[model samples]
Target: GSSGSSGPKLCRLAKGENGYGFHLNAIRGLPGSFIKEVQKGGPADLAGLEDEDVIIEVNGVNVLDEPYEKVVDRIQSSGKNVTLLVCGKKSGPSSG
Candidate 1:
């Protein structure tokens, strides 16, 4: 068993009647995209995505420096269900 480096999370979001349940936004010249918003008990919520999380890749495609609109296109193209690789501020289960 050898596991040291830990980064990025794979979130599988299945779109529901109310839509994918997560908002994506990114600013130009930023390092990565943002989760923006996540509805409680929604697809992205159950998928463990948190607000303000950074998007590293989409559907296995690295999106570093990618355009904001292009990122939306990427997610839109992946209908119904979409996969996201994200890095969050929370490292793990908070324990004292």
Candidate 2:
């Protein structure tokens, strides 16, 4: 949907939702930064990422909790599949 850009690269994580989700943003959508509204029917939206949630951690490590490089390495070594634990100002009803 992003024209000739091949659109957002969708992937999975071992988090609350199914693994694959969107990279909301890197420098711009950093932790604690209010994420820009994800488009409806998009990958992120379909995966259940909300607007006000602050990114807590990924793959059992906090974003600012460790050196950024290690985080990238962990994600890659985890076979591109990792866990994402985001903390929203509020939690949605638990499905399970």
Candidate 3:
């Protein structure tokens, strides 16, 4: 989804042997930018990526309304390191 009313956040992750150590899945009809998982002690985990956090942008590109494959492509093509705009907890999509 396009970030919630809570401002966006930055999550710089270093690509690991098994990718960024996180997974993403579509949110159906909505913007669909949900974080599926966060590998323990992985780049994403170390970078403070909490499980279930939503990803709004990848490498400066807004993936809010993009397809799951598109978001995955953006992250994969980003190379070694990548920057992501995420939202969670106190200022995430879930909060009202």
lDDT of each: 0.80, 0.49, 0.77
Query: Which candidate wins on TM-score?
Result: 1
| Candidate 2 per-residue C-alpha lDDT over 1-96 given as tens digits, one digit per residue, 9 for 90 to 100 | 555544222224433334334444344334333334555565556655656554556655566554446555655477644555655455556989
Expressed as tens digits, the lDDT of each residue in 3-95 for candidate 3 is 657576676899878677788877777684776677789998888787678878887777788888888888888898988887755334564
What is the clash count for each candidate, in the order shown?
Answer: 0, 6, 0
- Judging by lDDT against the true structure, name the best candidate: 1
Kindly report which residue stretches of model 1 are placed more than 4 angstroms away from their true locations once superposed: 1-4, 91-96
> Tens-digit lDDT track for model 1 on 1-96?
997997677778898966787897765667767886788898888999888777788888888778778778898889999888887575456778
Could you tell which candidate, 1 or 2, scores higher by lDDT? 1
Rank list by TM-score: 1, 3, 2
TM-score of each: 0.81, 0.42, 0.76
Model 3: lDDT of residue 89: 52
Instruction: Give lDDT: candidate 2, residue 74.
Output: 59
As a TM-score, model 2 comes out at 0.42
